Every structure is written in C-alpha cells, then in structure tokens.
C-alpha cells in the first residue's frame, strides 16, 4: 500500500453518516449516481463526500436523495452486495471530481489481470 | 486511521483459488482479488476495484468482505459488478 496522488482517483467518494463519521466508501459513476455496497446500509440521512484526499481541499458534501438497495441482499450469505445512490444535488465535476466507467454484463476481468483498489481502509463488515 | 487516500495494485484471482481459501461462501456473483501483503486492505467497504479495460478505468468489483484486516493474507471478496449490471441498468434508465 501507498499514498495516492491528490485528486488521482476522482470518482473515489467517502460515505459519512449524519454524525459525519466515515463508515463506507463509494464510486462516482455519474454526476448524480454513486455506487457502493449493500452491507454498508446507506440511508437518506447519510452524505457523499467527493474531491477528498486527506481525510484528516475543494471537497463537495453531497446529499443523498434516493437509495436503491439490491433487493436480493441477505446479511447471512452476503450475495448481491450492491447499492446505488441518487444524489439530491449533482456533483460539480472538475479536476478532482469525475466519474468511472461501468462494464457491460458480458465483460470479463479474468484472473491475473492487475487492477487497482483505493480508499481509507474503513470496513463495515 | 490512514489520513491520506491509499492505493494498491492487486490481481484478480480465480473462483477455484478463492473457493479453497473460503469455501461454499463464494458464489458466481463475487469477484475475488489479492496477492496479499497489504493490498486489498486499503479499500473501504463499498470502495472501488477498478481495472483498465481498453485504456480506461472500469469498475470490476465493489468491496464486500474479506478485506477486514491487513494482517490476514486470504483473498478479498468483491461484488462482481458485471453480474449485477442487469439490476444496475434497470434503475439507471
């Protein structure tokens, strides 16, 4: 692990609860859509924070309007663990804030291919 | 507590290699990834697992479980996005 360059993963967002404590991460797929996990248990009261590097710049605290939790998600098996969040106010896209592409249903990321993961290591489960 | 945004390059691992690590908990809607030693631990719950598909970063997985502690060397389990895209497309339109 290592420190990312400031504004290098511009789709990376933090999910803070009403109290302002980072509980989960997220990915901007559009100006008003964020994708995250279902086990996070995201609420309408939670907020999405974009343009963040140092958790401790031009950040955007965005409000959540609609929460689309996958209806096939059970906490026992933890299958279909995904949630899509429609933002109330859209994110102002800039140098440090922008979206990530989503793959097709037919696309494949096979074993051995080097991918990247980012965040502040805060796990819910 | 990492104050700054962390990153880590990790490989995808096969279902068979992930199944021997866990067992019946792994299913077709879960992508595994991690050649461990502090790599999958950087991602938050619901964080991105991004892969370069034709010169552009694509969301392959979403952090689900397995990446709880950096000390454990088992593969990290992510939500296979491609398998969940049919559900995703239904609400985005």
């Amino acid at each position: 692990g290592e420190d990312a360059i400031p504004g290098s993963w511009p789709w990376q967002v933090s999910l803070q609860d009403k109290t302002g404590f980072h509980f989960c991460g997220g990915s901007l797929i559009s100006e008003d859509w964020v994708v995250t996990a279902a086990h996070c248990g995201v609420k309408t009261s939670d907020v999405v924070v974009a343009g963040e590097f140092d958790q401790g710049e031009n950040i955007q605290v965005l409000k959540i309007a609609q929460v689309f939790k996958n209806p096939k998600f059970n906490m026992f098996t933890v299958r279909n663990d995904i949630t899509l969040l429609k933002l109330a106010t859209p994110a102002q896209f800039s140098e440090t804030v922008s979206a990530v592409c989503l793959p097709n249903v037919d696309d494949d990321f096979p074993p051995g291919t080097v991918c990247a993961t980012t965040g502040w290591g805060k796990t819910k489960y | 507590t990492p104050e700054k945004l962390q990153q880590a390059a990790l490989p995808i691992v096969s279902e068979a290699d992930c199944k021997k690590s866990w067992g019946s908990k792994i299913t077709d809607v879960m992508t595994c990834a991690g050649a461990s030693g502090v790599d999958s631990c950087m991602g938050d719950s619901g964080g991105p697992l991004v892969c370069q598909k034709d010169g552009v970063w694509t969301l392959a997985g979403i952090v689900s479980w397995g990446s709880g502690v950096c000390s454990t060397s088992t593969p990290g389990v992510y939500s296979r996005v491609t398998a969940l895209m049919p559900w995703v497309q239904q609400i985005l339109e």
């Binding site: 592409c101 | 390059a9 694509t58």
Partner: peptide
C-alpha cells in the same frame, strides 16, 4: 463526461 479518465493520472 469522460469516465475512467482522471485529469490527474494515477501512479501506482
């Protein structure tokens, strides 16, 4: 309006 193409490139 770009997707997966940051204006600041990631250096792993």
């Amino acid at each position: 309006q770009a997707c997966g193409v940051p204006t600041i490139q990631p250096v792993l």
